[PDB]
Amino acid sequence: DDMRGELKNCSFNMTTELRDKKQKVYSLFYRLDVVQINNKEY
Amino acid sequence: LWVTVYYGVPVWKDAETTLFCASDKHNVWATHACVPTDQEIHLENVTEEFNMWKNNMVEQMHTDIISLWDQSLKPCVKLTPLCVTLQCTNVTNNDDMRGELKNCSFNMTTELRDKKQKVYSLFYRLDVVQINNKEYRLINCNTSAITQACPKVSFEPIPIHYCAPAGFAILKCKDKKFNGTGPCPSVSTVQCTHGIKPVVSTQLLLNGSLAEEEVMIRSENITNNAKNILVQFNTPVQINCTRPNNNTRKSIRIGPGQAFYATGDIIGDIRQAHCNVSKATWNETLGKVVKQLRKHFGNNTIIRFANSSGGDLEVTTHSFNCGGEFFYCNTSGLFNSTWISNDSITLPCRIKQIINMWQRIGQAMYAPPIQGVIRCVSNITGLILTRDGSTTETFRPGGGDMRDNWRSELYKYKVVKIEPLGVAPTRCKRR
Amino acid sequence: FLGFLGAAGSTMGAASMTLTVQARNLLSVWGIKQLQARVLAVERYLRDQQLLGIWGCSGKLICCTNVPWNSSWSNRNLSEIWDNMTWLQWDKEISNYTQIIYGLLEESQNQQEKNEQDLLAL
Amino acid sequence: FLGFLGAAGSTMGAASMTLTVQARNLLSVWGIKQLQARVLAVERYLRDQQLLGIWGCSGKLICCTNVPWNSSWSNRNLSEIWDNMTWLQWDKEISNYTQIIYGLLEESQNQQEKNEQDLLAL
Amino acid sequence: FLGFLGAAGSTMGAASMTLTVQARNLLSVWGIKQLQARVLAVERYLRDQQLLGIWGCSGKLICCTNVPWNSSWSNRNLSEIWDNMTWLQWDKEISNYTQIIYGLLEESQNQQEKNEQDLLAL
Ligand SMILES: *[C@@H]1O[C@H](CO)[C@@H](O[C@@H]2O[C@H](CO)[C@@H](O[C@@H]3O[C@H](CO[C@H]4O[C@H](CO)[C@@H](O)[C@H](O[C@H]5O[C@H](CO)[C@@H](O)[C@H](O)[C@@H]5O)[C@@H]4O)[C@@H](O)[C@H](O[C@H]4O[C@H](CO)[C@@H](O)[C@H](O)[C@@H]4O)[C@@H]3O)[C@H](O)[C@H]2NC(C)=O)[C@H](O)[C@H]1NC(C)=O
Ligand SMILES: *[C@@H]1O[C@H](CO)[C@@H](O[C@@H]2O[C@H](CO)[C@@H](O)[C@H](O)[C@H]2NC(C)=O)[C@H](O)[C@H]1NC(C)=O
Ligand SMILES: *[C@@H]1O[C@H](CO)[C@@H](O[C@@H]2O[C@H](CO)[C@@H](O)[C@H](O)[C@H]2NC(C)=O)[C@H](O)[C@H]1NC(C)=O
Ligand SMILES: *[C@@H]1O[C@H](CO)[C@@H](O[C@@H]2O[C@H](CO)[C@@H](O)[C@H](O)[C@H]2NC(C)=O)[C@H](O)[C@H]1NC(C)=O
Ligand SMILES: *[C@@H]1O[C@H](CO)[C@@H](O[C@@H]2O[C@H](CO)[C@@H](O)[C@H](O)[C@H]2NC(C)=O)[C@H](O)[C@H]1NC(C)=O
Ligand SMILES: *[C@@H]1O[C@H](CO)[C@@H](O[C@@H]2O[C@H](CO)[C@@H](O)[C@H](O)[C@H]2NC(C)=O)[C@H](O)[C@H]1NC(C)=O
Ligand SMILES: *[C@@H]1O[C@H](CO)[C@@H](O)[C@H](O)[C@H]1NC(C)=O
Ligand SMILES: *[C@@H]1O[C@H](CO)[C@@H](O)[C@H](O)[C@H]1NC(C)=O
Ligand SMILES: *[C@@H]1O[C@H](CO)[C@@H](O)[C@H](O)[C@H]1NC(C)=O
Ligand SMILES: *[C@@H]1O[C@H](CO)[C@@H](O)[C@H](O)[C@H]1NC(C)=O
Ligand SMILES: *[C@@H]1O[C@H](CO)[C@@H](O)[C@H](O)[C@H]1NC(C)=O
Ligand SMILES: *[C@@H]1O[C@H](CO)[C@@H](O)[C@H](O)[C@H]1NC(C)=O
Ligand SMILES: *[C@@H]1O[C@H](CO)[C@@H](O)[C@H](O)[C@H]1NC(C)=O
Ligand SMILES: *[C@@H]1O[C@H](CO)[C@@H](O)[C@H](O)[C@H]1NC(C)=O
Ligand SMILES: *[C@@H]1O[C@H](CO)[C@@H](O)[C@H](O)[C@H]1NC(C)=O
Ligand SMILES: *[C@@H]1O[C@H](CO)[C@@H](O)[C@H](O)[C@H]1NC(C)=O
């Protein structure tokens, strides 16, 4: 019923400004932008 | 009296337009973006008003020198793989050139994507930033990736002539006492300017054009201390560079067809890079500068030359290029004197390989090592001074803005728009 | 022979004998910039030649016309205009009366076009 | 004054007194668009000026020529052409014969160019 | 009708019948190659029209001047130039005398421009 039912809280590894370092970050993605792969995987 | 229309009258208005290059191994400001050259007509009784400080040729030349710089760097190597972690140790572990270097070892990509390459190089301490054999990284790696200065293009400035299009003319002030502003009794229409070498330097106008009769002081507002003072010498002061080291350039294949040129070893004379200015010649040149500088501040005032205040290394030092390798000289022994109403001066110069030239952020350049010993002979043909805001006036060297370097060569030129259609009264009457 | 703009400081009478020198020089990163400078030179030249043709002065350097000289434009006599003033000084004096004179020449020829059209009809 | 194309609905006789109005309006990514339209306007203007030159009509807006009217192009008399029709109605009538007349005007001038040329040799 | 350059091999007398055939054919990154060729043709054509205009020959295919033919340029009689030579042969003979002739024609017109301008004020 809310806006929060339209969102997925997605966590992912992202590149850093240094090529050899990673970055565990997260973001709120709309369910219309993420497709599941078959905390699930999207 | 009747109106009669004359077409082709010698009338001009001030105008801003796009002047095209002309020139007479590829270069940064190459001849492939210019036109072959071929002239000067003396306009008697013409007294035009020039303004070297609101001249649009200076603003356009700055854009074009930048544009030819970037255009000459796109087709060659971008050093994205050079942002790895560096395991850097000292070279000397103890006054020399080797105290300025870090011996940095890193994993580099090979021409095959799945294979690595344990290589090493000698990086200047000014190019590596520590991460907290310690761990370092290249200095311009959190801001951009350094496109390698392409090894087959030279940084030597070739003279370029800025030529006006059709319907425009370039007025040249032939007055020898013309500071930078006001009427100029002797004017000429040149097809286009003399060869202006785009020498890029700070605090000192290396090479270029001398004054005719006496040292010329040129400021937009001499009473405003926020305005740079463009001194122009009448006799050049010769300055000799050197990097005494016998460098050994080393090639690393960072990818298919891409090579990274690295300092593998340094031998030979390990004295710090320096510039020599004759102590007698510089003292008499500052004497001429002081004599022409008391005319704007008083005969009894005390003219004191101090050294640069502070800021970036590109603005606190006589930054310049010589032999393809970029120097940053102290010039604190040049500007150290107080003037009351065989020997040489050695300026310790640092060297960098990662260059953010045009006072920009996000576009660096890696100048590759130059094999061998670098030697240098230049003429100091001017200065860029700043005044401190009492009977004592202190003049520190200035710079930073590259436009004041080319404002010193395009001070005598002016672009006008020909207005060839004029009406005037005459006893005519159309039949 | 003085050269291009050589008679800029000369009197209006003396500078009118060298109109050909200035006339022939109005027609003839370094790519499109140099190319659009040539197209601008042609367009500037062609719109000046169009004005002469509209006033009936096509193919002429000195074109005596029929529009009388309104004394409001300049009360000076011929002696002190063609022997005491230069063309740059003269252009400054009548720079604001240029457009009203241009309309007068444009309509005067348009009247002459229909006047000679009717004369030829007889 | 009517303005540009203002006499489009005026009869042919009335619209021929406003030729200077239309004549002066034929000359004056996203940078080539502006630039290529200007070059095409100059080229089109020069094509029509070239045609007038080879017909002997250079520098003229109304140019009486030596080519007779065949009456197979238009059988209408002068009263009903210059006082009833407009230039748009007329254009749609002799569009078929336009290139026939354009060839006769060029040929007549070329013969007239030499008859006058041979006359000066005496 | 021989066509464009058809009279290239004809004698100078016969080749002058067809000056209008060559005259009309001088005017009409891959886009720029075509576009720059169009601009070159226009400014090349205009420089020739400008030369005719300053000699008092604008709008004429054959123009008579007031410059006497110095025999140094060519001493051949009139009968062996217009009936024996072609225009291509003639251009190679007076090629080095072309520029000095061009200056004389320019100096002859502006002398007539001022003389007629002076006489018109009487
Ligand atoms: C500074 O330090 C550098 C090293 O970094 C010194 O340079 C070297 O000098 C020695 C001589 O002192 C050279 O050795 C000779 O090699 C020549 C033939 O060399 C040719 O082939 C080499 C291998 O491919 C090549 O490196 C040479 O140099 C070219 O290429 C480099 C880049 O790689 C470039 O920088 C150069 O400018 C050249 O384009 C070159 O093509 C050989 O004939 C010499 O003579 C010996 O052998 C003969 C018999 O064959 C014998 O008769 C002689 O008596 C002698 O014994 C000798 O082998 C070495 O090649 C140079 N190396 C480089 C990298 O250039 C430099 O001299 C130091 N300078 C100072 C100021 O001290
Ligand atoms: C981010 O990357 C880490 C590894 O760098 C991922 O953690 C691993 O997850 C796999 C399961 O897919 C485990 O087998 C490993 O043991 C984990 N390694 C660790 C925890 O160090 C992590 O899942 C990634 N996060 C994402 C993709 O959101
Ligand atoms: C180059 O890469 C190698 C690995 O391919 C690095 O060696 C590793 O270093 C880490 C410590 O950071 C050790 O935990 C590993 O055991 C090492 N692996 C080996 C030795 O095979 C080496 O440090 C890199 N060199 C650099 C970054 O200069
Ligand atoms: C990129 O990294 C450099 C080096 O860490 C940053 O410059 C430093 O900034 C801090 C904070 O002001 C200073 O204390 C250091 O003295 C600076 N070092 C140098 C060598 O100047 C720089 O700010 C970083 N750039 C960005 C965009 O993050
Ligand atoms: C000032 O001009 C001198 C003379 O042209 C430059 O020195 C020359 O540099 C080139 C390229 O490095 C050498 O090939 C010449 O042999 C040098 N000449 C002499 C006499 O040494 C000098 O580099 C210029 N100063 C600059 C560009 O800052
Ligand atoms: C440039 O030269 C100056 C002066 O030689 C150096 O800085 C000062 O040096 C004097 C004695 O030589 C000391 O008393 C000061 O404390 C120094 N000031 C400092 C270090 O800030 C300076 O080191 C030289 N180099 C640079 C890059 O400034
Ligand atoms: C400048 O003026 C002098 C006389 O005042 C005159 O003789 C001379 O011709 C003038 N200059 C030019 C270029 O005409
Ligand atoms: C490396 O050099 C720096 C500066 O010269 C010095 O502070 C440091 O102690 C040296 N590291 C050694 C000797 O391990
Ligand atoms: C430069 O010289 C002109 C003419 O002598 C003078 O009017 C002007 O004031 C000078 N410039 C300054 C900044 O005073
Ligand atoms: C500068 O002078 C010193 C001695 O004062 C000398 O050893 C050095 O070679 C000189 N360098 C140059 C480039 O002239
Ligand atoms: C600079 O070097 C030249 C030779 O290259 C020498 O003649 C001159 O004396 C030197 N001058 C200085 C100030 O080092
Ligand atoms: C100027 O000189 C002083 C000492 O005289 C020094 O501390 C300072 O760092 C110098 N500034 C520069 C070279 O920019
Ligand atoms: C410095 O200028 C002199 C003349 O003033 C010249 O002979 C010499 O070659 C110049 N040195 C350079 C450009 O390095
Ligand atoms: C002359 O000019 C004045 C304005 O300067 C204007 O009022 C007047 O009508 C003009 N006379 C003629 C005959 O055009
Ligand atoms: C009129 O045109 C026709 C062909 O349409 C032609 O046969 C006839 O000769 C022309 N009339 C005259 C007088 O030439
Ligand atoms: C013809 O030209 C020659 C130069 O070849 C010249 O000497 C001679 O005077 C000219 N004849 C004239 C001007 O009548």
CSV table of C-alpha atoms in Angstrom, one decimal, chain C residues 13 16-18 20 23-28 32 35 38-39 42 45-46 58-64, chain E residues 32 35-36 39-40 42-43 46-47 49-51 53-56 58 106 109-110 113-114 116-117 120:
chain,number,residue,atom,x,y,z
C,13,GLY,CA,38.9,63.9,-53.1
C,16,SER,CA,38.4,58.6,-54.3
C,17,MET,CA,41.1,58.0,-57.0
C,18,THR,CA,42.2,54.8,-55.2
C,20,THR,CA,39.9,50.1,-56.9
C,23,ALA,CA,37.6,47.2,-53.8
C,24,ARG,CA,39.8,44.4,-55.1
C,25,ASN,CA,40.8,43.4,-51.6
C,26,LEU,CA,37.3,42.7,-50.3
C,27,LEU,CA,36.9,39.3,-52.0
C,28,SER,CA,40.2,37.4,-51.6
C,32,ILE,CA,35.9,24.9,-40.9
C,35,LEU,CA,36.3,27.8,-44.6
C,38,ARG,CA,35.7,32.7,-46.9
C,39,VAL,CA,32.0,32.2,-47.0
C,42,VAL,CA,31.6,36.3,-50.1
C,45,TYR,CA,30.8,41.3,-50.7
C,46,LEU,CA,27.6,40.1,-52.3
C,58,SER,CA,25.9,48.0,-60.5
C,59,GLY,CA,29.3,47.7,-62.0
C,60,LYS,CA,30.4,51.2,-61.0
C,61,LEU,CA,32.8,52.6,-58.4
C,62,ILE,CA,31.6,56.2,-58.5
C,63,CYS,CA,27.8,56.4,-59.1
C,64,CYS,CA,26.2,59.8,-59.4
E,32,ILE,CA,32.1,18.6,-47.2
E,35,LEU,CA,30.3,21.3,-50.4
E,36,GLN,CA,33.8,22.6,-50.6
E,39,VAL,CA,32.2,27.0,-52.8
E,40,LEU,CA,35.4,26.9,-54.9
E,42,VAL,CA,31.4,30.2,-56.7
E,43,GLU,CA,34.5,32.2,-55.6
E,46,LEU,CA,33.1,35.7,-58.8
E,47,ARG,CA,36.8,36.6,-59.2
E,49,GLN,CA,33.2,38.6,-62.8
E,50,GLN,CA,35.0,41.1,-60.5
E,51,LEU,CA,37.8,41.4,-63.0
E,53,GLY,CA,33.6,44.6,-63.6
E,54,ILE,CA,36.7,46.7,-62.8
E,55,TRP,CA,37.6,46.7,-66.5
E,56,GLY,CA,34.2,48.1,-67.5
E,58,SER,CA,30.6,43.5,-66.6
E,106,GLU,CA,42.3,48.1,-64.8
E,109,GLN,CA,38.7,51.8,-66.7
E,110,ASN,CA,39.4,53.9,-63.6
E,113,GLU,CA,35.6,56.3,-64.5
E,114,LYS,CA,37.0,59.6,-63.3
E,116,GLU,CA,33.3,60.5,-67.2
E,117,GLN,CA,32.6,61.5,-63.5
E,120,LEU,CA,29.2,64.6,-65.9
